[PDB]
Amino acid sequence: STQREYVFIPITNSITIDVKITIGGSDHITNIDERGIHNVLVITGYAVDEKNGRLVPTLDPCDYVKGILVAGTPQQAQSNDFLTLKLPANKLYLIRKKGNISDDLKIYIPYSSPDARNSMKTKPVSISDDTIVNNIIKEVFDKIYNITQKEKVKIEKVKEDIKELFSYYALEQ
Amino acid sequence: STQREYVFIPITNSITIDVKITIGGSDHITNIDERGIHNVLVITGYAVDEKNGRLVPTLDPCDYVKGILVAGTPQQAQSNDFLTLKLPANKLYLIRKKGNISDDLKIYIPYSSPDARNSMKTKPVSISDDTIVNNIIKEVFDKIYNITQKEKVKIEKVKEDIKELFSYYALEQ
Amino acid sequence: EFLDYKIIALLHDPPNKAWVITGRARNLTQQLSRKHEKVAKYIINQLFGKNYSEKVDNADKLASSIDRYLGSIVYKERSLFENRSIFLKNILLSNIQRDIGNLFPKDKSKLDNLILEYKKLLNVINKTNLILKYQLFYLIYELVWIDSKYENTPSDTRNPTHTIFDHLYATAAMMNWILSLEKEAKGYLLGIDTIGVADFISKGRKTRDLWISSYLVSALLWYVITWFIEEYGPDVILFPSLRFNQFYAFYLLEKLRKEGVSEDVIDEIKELITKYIFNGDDLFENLKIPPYPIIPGRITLILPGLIREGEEYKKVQDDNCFISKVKERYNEGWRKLIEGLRCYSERKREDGFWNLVCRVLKLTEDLLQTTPLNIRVKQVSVTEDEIFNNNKLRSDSWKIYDNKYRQLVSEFKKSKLVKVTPESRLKLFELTKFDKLPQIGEKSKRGYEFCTSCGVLPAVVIMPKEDELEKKLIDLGIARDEKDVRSIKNMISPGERLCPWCLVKRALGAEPRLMRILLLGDLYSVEKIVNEIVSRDVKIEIPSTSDIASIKTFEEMIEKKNEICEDLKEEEVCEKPSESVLSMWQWFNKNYYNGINLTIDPEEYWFSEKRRRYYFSVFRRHRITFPSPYYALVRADSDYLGDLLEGKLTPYLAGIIDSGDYANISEKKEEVNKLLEEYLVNAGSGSIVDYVKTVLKCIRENLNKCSCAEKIYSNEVAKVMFRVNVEKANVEEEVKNSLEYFETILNEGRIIVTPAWHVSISSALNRGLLVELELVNKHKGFVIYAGGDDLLAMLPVDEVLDFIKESRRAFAGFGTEKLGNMCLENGFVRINNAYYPSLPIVGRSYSVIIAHYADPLFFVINDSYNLLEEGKEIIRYRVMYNGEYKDAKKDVAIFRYQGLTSVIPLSLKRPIVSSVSDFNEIASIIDVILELKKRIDEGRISVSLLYDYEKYKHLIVASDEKYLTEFLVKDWIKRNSLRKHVEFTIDEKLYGVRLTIENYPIKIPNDLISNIVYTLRIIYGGEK
Ligand SMILES: [Zn+2]
């Protein structure tokens, strides 16, 4: 099996890629075959600050976040703010399951120190402002999952695909 | 800014102290005055690790780690062993809540590293076996007052909320 | 008449009552403007608003017994008997609860967050098509509520033994009575039953025959009840509950696919269905049919007395308008399946095996007219007289539904006295006396050559033996040429005779998508259904008993691939998957992709004769163990479930009281009351319990006779002043009616059955079905049918013991790690913070036949229904009941291996669960066999352990001092142990069980430890 790295969804140009190398292997997690971005995960209580973002947490179920999993390098090989976590993959709050999933993992979620001595101030709002939709695929798809997304039968709805799904949570701080 | 603590309630013989001297006051949450244990706290998405009596997060919003928020001092030593967060009291998963408390808090939650040297699994478990309730409630929580077990006319009632409310998820490793 | 007033009932009480009632947030009722009806009215913004008349009031009363239990006027009062703690109590047990503190829409900011989801799902249905608005909302009501992660709340904080979602569906089902009685009154409780299911399943050579014949039972019944789904929408089906069917949801999607709908709303609703109705298995989307034949078997409707054909509903013409309608709606499905099979077979007129099916579907038209399944329908009725005084409910009306369902059950058991096999309807006298029987193939040297699957009917397609097939296929009419032979042989074995009915089973076994004709029903024309089947190349391969007997071999050469690979290179073992075929078997699908080609017929391989020694040598060099020819046919069935639907107490005290005892409940008055008094007091906790605690006090030995008010008036009258709103509460009558209620309960010795009691048991029975399917997939098994309480699977002999262990406990709600998207929490299945009750008390017996893969599947299935269903009926063991030692008889898990029989009780405690600590010892003898079996194959204990027990047995039997027996088994273990550090204990509550059996051709050792030894010999006998 391959070790993975869940890439999240920002709002600004800063926290889109945050990783320097690509697949390495060949077997992956997320698929967008023709109609929908399949196999996307959700994690409860984890903001990513959408600027200076390293997965700051939240302490309730109502908070969550969603983004696709890629089996890429652990974010330019830093040994500071990871989790060194893995589990039989029967414990993933994934959306749009498709097919038998591998029953292992090795994920290093870049979850840093929480935002100390500040209240939640967390904002539930989905992704909007299509200029932000084009902002993300500008740098996260045309080379990471670019086997598709350039000449597929339907690419312009993959932008539509993130319209429905992603509704992150940020601390507004 | 109540310097809070979270002593959780598993069957383990590892929750002996893990903490030290009192809140800084007496505005507690052991609201056992009326009918037994009141105002429970349940973390969502954490393990209990069945050993090394701290908590480990696992990223599915399916887990319950329960225990009473009795404040105090984190052994007077730790800073990184806890999330160091600031809750406004309205962003938790609570049980048996009384009149709303609209203040804000300090957060020290017993944390074990994710450290998936092994694989992470979730093991359902609860409390039974009279000696298994005889051990822990006498270890710590009976000493919150020690006026309990002194004149407490609800001994038959408080003894059950260990096997009624606090159901945690072990590690199976 | 346009009634459609059930949506007013399905939302009359929002899934936020317990937080809105005796308020927690109390501001989402502020931030829009009776208290809980306001938040109930606000969410009704799509269409017609709530009617404060005969649309909820009377329906909500007869829906559940929470108007009798906790009083009629204090139910509708939300006042004085308050309790500001939302517990959720199980319905079968009451000593088990969850706690439901706060996960719910608290503000309109969060409240409308889901109303936009409700609307964005029904915004796609044209507003003229209200029947799709109801059908869709019916299934997705609680689904979109579970996705938006909200805790499930009880229908009443006082008596928390009813989930609000179930009580909502309950009052909507009773709504068909209330409505049709407000009009010209008539209301029916229709019920359908299938005569001889097991005998229909047991007719098949292969498992694809077993699987198809087990799928016809579900399809033919689904094609009937889908007509009621189309006429009166859902909620007219009490059993099986629709709110979790895999058959309904599948039919529901193809309705949206029909008539056009938003492609990302039919999809928006398809991740809901895949996540919850199924468990993350979109295999049905690729299969195009629901993978598992869920057999309801016993369907009970609650119909209104209103019929269509007036272009809209009218008064029903005659009472027989419903029985005749089903009987003809049932034979239509058989015709419409013979139609599609005829059409499809001519579409593929070439390709072989279909030019044969064409030749018989035409030669035997008259025979195939008759359905081979022969259901039986019954019906009762109600009138305005039995339910109303003038226009309001009458006293004692609350028991009408219970009594009406009583007559329905009796009428079934009354008719089950005469068993009419479906073969009797055929006309075969002149077809066998004179040689007019069409015999495509060989000519019977001796008459007509009975079928090899049935055995009863004569055969139409006789097959030559393996002298040689080609020169005997092509000359005879069977084969037109030679190329079709290898295509006929692929579906019919040489020597196999087939009757018209069984060939239809084989034909549908070659193309299971043809079942869509019955699955959807009156949605697509038969030709449109067939077209999509010939417009594709789906290849659905179904396992056989030789495939199941090769799991550990396949799974061994699948991880020694490269090594086992070079030597053959040509034997299709290292062939590469050349197609993308699929299967309902979630083990074939699960691998299929390790260059191993799981499609190879093992009977041309290690299970062959020209190739046996070869693959013995092949397996020899690679340390691969030669496979055993034995599989395990596991058949589960719950105990006294239908007897539980009558509200009886036999499922609780199985064996201590039997179904026969209810002919005179006074003979068991001491026990039936000890339980019923316990169920009532524990249910309905809060300030109310001490009130009812005193009402059951003043009964016991023919007590006060209404002179108990004195003790309980003080309870109520000193409580009614807690709020100044008492309208006309005649407390001297209120406490009387409550005393009248519990009286009938204790006199009848059974819970008074209401719709909510049924809908809850029914829905839980469908959720337990979900977790039961993950377990049969987890243990590499093959589900043959699993509908509700029943189950039929084919496991390997290896995973059979631990399957029973997990399946038995998962049925009781207790369990370890989640299976799909649902966990098992001590008698409460939980789907994303939503707690649902299970059936912890209901016993569940098992029947394991360890059979050779070559044994005739007719007599293996027959034994499984005549090893248990008449062997489980006679087995008694010594159960621990309230300190005494009584004799229970149920929940036994029988094992059988060609003569050897074993019985392993799963409870040993007669009220199987009375506290949350009762779960961890259900099936506690199984892991005793599992641990023992584990220590043997590791050489830590010799297998001679099973052979020496005979001499230790007489001492362990005669010894009644447990400190002495815990040394005799410690000695018997260590003597024939192969090491010096094996410390294997026996739970010590297993010393003395004494399983007996009344004069039967089944010899069971009369002690438990001996049965543990026989169970191992049976498990080990089926591995060599
Ligand atoms: Zn036949």
Contact C995, C903 (CB under 8 A): yes
- DSSP for residue C329: H
CB contact under 8 A, A84 and B114: yes
The whole-angstrom separation of Cα C917 and Cα C1008 is: 23
Residue C578 exposed, middle or buried by CB count within 10 Å (0-12, 13-18, 19+)? exposed
Which of C394, C421, C517 is CA-nearest to residue C197? C421
Q: Which two tokens stand for residue C160?
A: 């928390």
Contact B41, B66 (CB under 8 A): yes
Secondary structure class of C992 (helix, strand, coil) = coil
The whole-angstrom separation of Cα C740 and Cα B39 is: 39
Q: Where are the alpha helices (DSSP H) in C825-978?
A: 857-867, 924-937, 945-958, 962-975
The dihedral through the CA atoms of B75, B80, B81, B84 has a sign that is positive
Secondary structure class of A165 (helix, strand, coil) = helix
Omega into A57 within 30° of 0, i.e. cis?
no
The whole-angstrom separation of Cα C860 and Cα C792 is: 12
Tell how strand B105-106 and strand B2-3 pair up: parallel
The string of DSSP letters for C589-638 reads TTSS-SS--TTS-GGGTTT-SSSHHHHHHHHHHTTPPPPPSEEEEEEEEE
- The phi, psi pair for C712, rounded to 5°, reads -110, -20
Which of C545, C539, C447, C459 is CA-nearest to residue C502? C459
Contact A38, A47 (CB under 8 A): no
C689-697 and C669-682 helices, crossing angle to 10°:
160
The whole-angstrom separation of Cα A148 and Cα A134 is: 16
Residue C714 exposed, middle or buried by CB count within 10 Å (0-12, 13-18, 19+)? middle
The whole-angstrom separation of Cα C539 and Cα A89 is: 30
> What is the Cα Rg of chain B in Å?
16
The dihedral through the CA atoms of C141, C145, C147, C152 has a sign that is negative
- Kindly state the helix (H) or strand (E) to which residue C179 belongs, with its residue range: helix C164-182
Secondary structure class of C883 (helix, strand, coil) = coil
Which of C982, C952, C948 is CA-nearest to residue C964? C952
Which residues form the domain of B169? 1-173
Which CA distances in Å does B115 have to A76, A84, A102, A105, B15? 20, 6, 21, 13, 20
Secondary structure class of C942 (helix, strand, coil) = coil
Residue C664 exposed, middle or buried by CB count within 10 Å (0-12, 13-18, 19+)? exposed
Chain B residues within an 8 Å CB radius of C916: 126, 128, 163
Tell how strand C894-897 and strand C844-852 pair up: parallel
Ligand-binding site membership of C366 (annotated): no
A154 CB near a chain C CB, below 8 Å? no
When CB atoms are compared, the residue of C263, C271, C818 closest to A96 is C271
In sequence order, which residues have a C-beta less than 8 Å from that of residue A153 and are 6 or more positions away? Answer: A34
The string of DSSP letters for C69-116 reads TT-STTGGG-SSS--S--EEE-SS-SS-EEE--S-S--SHHHHHHHHH
Q: Which two tokens stand for residue C12?
A: 């009359």
Q: Where are the alpha helices (DSSP H) in chain A?
A: 130-140, 156-165
Q: Which experiment gave this structure? A: cryo-EM
Which of C667, C836, C749, C718 is CA-nearest to residue C152? C836
Contact B44, B66 (CB under 8 A): no
Residue C587 exposed, middle or buried by CB count within 10 Å (0-12, 13-18, 19+)? buried
> What is the CA angle C403-C406-C409, rounded to 5?
160
The whole-angstrom separation of Cα B7 and Cα B82 is: 12
Q: Which two tokens stand for residue A40?
A: 């996307």
Contact C94, C763 (CB under 8 A): no
- Count of structural domains, chain B: 1
In sequence order, which residues have a C-beta less than 8 Å from that of residue B150 and are 6 or more positions away? Answer: none
| Residues in a beta bridge with C630 | C852
Longest dimension (CA), chain B: 48
The whole-angstrom separation of Cα C746 and Cα C678 is: 11
Secondary structure class of C441 (helix, strand, coil) = coil
Which of C754, C666, C923 is CA-nearest to residue C63? C754
Secondary structure class of A29 (helix, strand, coil) = coil
Contact C809, C912 (CB under 8 A): no
How many C-beta neighbours within 10 Å does residue C125 have? Answer: 21
Secondary structure class of C227 (helix, strand, coil) = helix
Which of A79, A102, B46, B45 is CA-nearest to residue C149? B45
Chain B residues within an 8 Å CB radius of C689: none
The whole-angstrom separation of Cα C636 and Cα C800 is: 12
Which CA distances in Å does C874 have to C567, C997, C998? 55, 6, 6
B101 CB near a chain C CB, below 8 Å? no
Amino acid at C34: R
Chain C residues within an 8 Å CB radius of B129: 917
Q: Which two tokens stand for residue B42?
A: 């349940």
Resolution, angstroms, 1 dp? 2.8
Q: Which two tokens stand for residue C785?
A: 């049918």
Which of C951, C497, C887, C473 is CA-nearest to residue C654? C887
In sequence order, which residues have a C-beta less than 8 Å from that of residue C125 and are 6 or more positions away? Answer: C132, C133, C136, C261
The whole-angstrom separation of Cα C645 and Cα A74 is: 57
When CB atoms are compared, the residue of B43, B88, B116 closest to A86 is B116
The whole-angstrom separation of Cα C56 and Cα C923 is: 44
Q: Which two tokens stand for residue A69?
A: 């999993």
In sequence order, which residues have a C-beta less than 8 Å from that of residue C183 and are 6 or more positions away? Answer: C1, C306, C315
The whole-angstrom separation of Cα C869 and Cα C638 is: 11
Residue of B37, B66, B95, B172 to mutate, testing the C interface (most C Cβ within 10 Å of its Cβ)? B95
How many C-beta neighbours within 10 Å does residue C38 have? Answer: 15
Q: How many CB pairs under 8 A join A and C?
A: 22
First to last CA, chain A: 39
Q: Which two tokens stand for residue B154?
A: 């609800």
Contact C628, C1023 (CB under 8 A): yes
Helices (H) and strands (E) in chain C, counts: 38, 21
Q: Which two tokens stand for residue B107?
A: 């957060």
CB contact under 8 A, B93 and C103: yes
The whole-angstrom separation of Cα C272 and Cα C270 is: 5
CB contact under 8 A, C815 and B165: no
- The phi, psi pair for C829, rounded to 5°, reads -70, 130
Q: How far is CA C272 from the centre of its chain?
A: 21
Contact C217, C297 (CB under 8 A): yes
Q: Which two tokens stand for residue C840?
A: 């912890």
Contact C314, C306 (CB under 8 A): yes
CB contact under 8 A, B120 and A87: yes
How many C-beta neighbours within 10 Å does residue C598 have? Answer: 25
In sequence order, which residues have a C-beta less than 8 Å from that of residue C141 and are 6 or more positions away? Answer: C10, C165, C168, C243
Three-state SS for C957-977 is HHCCCHHHHHHHHHHHHHHCE
Q: Which two tokens stand for residue C981?
A: 């550090």
Which of C405, C273, C299, C389 is CA-nearest to residue C753? C405
Three-state SS for A110-131 is CCCCCCCCCCCCCEECCCCCHH
When CB atoms are compared, the residue of A35, A90, A98 closest to C282 is A98
Query: How far is the centre of ligand 1, averaged over its atoms, from the C-alpha of C100 (Å)?
Result: 55
Which of C203, C825, C900, C81 is CA-nearest to residue C502? C203
Query: How far is the centre of ligand 1, averaged over its atoms, from the C-alpha of C370 (Å)?
Result: 14
The whole-angstrom separation of Cα A14 and Cα C437 is: 82
The answer for A24, left when phi > 0, alpha when psi is -120 to 50, beta otherwise, is left
Contact B46, B65 (CB under 8 A): yes
Q: Which two tokens stand for residue A138?
A: 């500008």
SS3 helix, strand, coil % of chain C, rounded to 5?
45, 10, 45
Which of C543, C216, C177 is CA-nearest to residue C380? C177
Contact C861, C211 (CB under 8 A): no
- Kindly state the helix (H) or strand (E) to which residue C895 belongs, with its residue range: strand C894-897
The whole-angstrom separation of Cα C362 and Cα C849 is: 39
Contact C151, C104 (CB under 8 A): yes
Which CA distances in Å does C547 have to A75, C553, C554, C607, C997? 46, 10, 9, 10, 36
- Kindly state the helix (H) or strand (E) to which residue A42 belongs, with its residue range: strand A40-44
Chain B residues within an 8 Å CB radius of C815: 124
The whole-angstrom separation of Cα C830 and Cα C837 is: 9
Helices (H) and strands (E) in chain A, counts: 2, 8
The whole-angstrom separation of Cα B156 and Cα B39 is: 19
The whole-angstrom separation of Cα C394 and Cα A125 is: 53
Tell how strand B40-44 and strand B94-95 pair up: antiparallel
The whole-angstrom separation of Cα C226 and Cα C232 is: 10
| Residues in a beta bridge with B94 | B41
Contact C412, C299 (CB under 8 A): no
Query: How far is the centre of ligand 1, averaged over its atoms, from the C-alpha of C459 (Å)?
Result: 7
Q: Which two tokens stand for residue B66?
A: 């329960």
C917: nearest CA partner in chain B: B128
Contact C903, C894 (CB under 8 A): yes
A107: nearest CA partner in chain B: B116
Ligand-binding site membership of C901 (annotated): no
Which CA distances in Å does C671 have to C749, C873, C969? 10, 22, 36
Which CA distances in Å does C306 have to A171, C4, C164, C590? 58, 12, 28, 49
CB contact under 8 A, C590 and A100: yes
Q: Which two tokens stand for residue C416?
A: 């089950």
Secondary structure class of C735 (helix, strand, coil) = helix
The whole-angstrom separation of Cα C151 and Cα C160 is: 14
Which CA distances in Å does C628 have to B33, B43, C545, C551, C631? 66, 49, 12, 10, 8
Scored b (16 or more CB within 10 A) or e, C394-411 reads eeebbbbbbebbbebbee
